[PDB]
Design a protein around this ligand. Sequence first.
Ligand code: NAG
Ligand code: CA
Length: 216
Amino acid sequence: CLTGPRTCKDLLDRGHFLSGWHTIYLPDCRPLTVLCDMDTDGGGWTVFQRRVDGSVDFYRDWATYKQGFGSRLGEFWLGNDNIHALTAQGTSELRTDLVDFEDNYQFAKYRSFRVADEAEKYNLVLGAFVEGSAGDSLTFHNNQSFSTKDQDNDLNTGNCAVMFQGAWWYKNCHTSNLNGRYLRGTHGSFANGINWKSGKGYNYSYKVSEMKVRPA
Ligand SMILES: CC(=O)N[C@@H]1[C@@H](O)[C@H](O)[C@@H](CO)O[C@H]1O
Ligand SMILES: [Ca+2]
């Protein structure tokens, strides 16, 4: 690197006009292949989580969220080292794109988004809600560790992850649960869906969810 591309924004600027898997060089100069959203909100986004059809188990242990899981063809989670590697110098706006089972689109936009290395538990450190029709359902979670069903760092007696069946920056427990189960719309189970509270509440699992970052 030094010669190559360092962000999706960079690849947009080089005239990569369609979304897809391209290879950016991280700050450590290691190469990572990522999904570039070249479209939404003027494009240039590096997509780090994607749900879209129910095909992948997001109910995953710590190691599995450390490395990343899923498929390039479908849903995935880029992995918590990669995510940290991504947002750990400079600063990255965060966007969250949601789409329901009727194609009513919603988003939410934050001015900075960054996350701790494994040691500091991949602690979330989020800036300021900018806008978006889904409302703020991410600030609540600011300054929290990341947990999973086999690694509890939550401020609730029990296991937020085990009870709401996800992986997240879980306090007591959440307002957002984008890694929860794919429950395809209305659900009677309580909050263990792909949920964004201000978005569509604790009983409705979105059809698409995307979380992405561009350099501000
Ligand atoms: C990046 C990609 O291919 N996925 C798209 C993306 O442009 C967008 O985030 C979302 C609505 O914004 O719809 C997704 O399916
Ligand atoms: Ca706990």
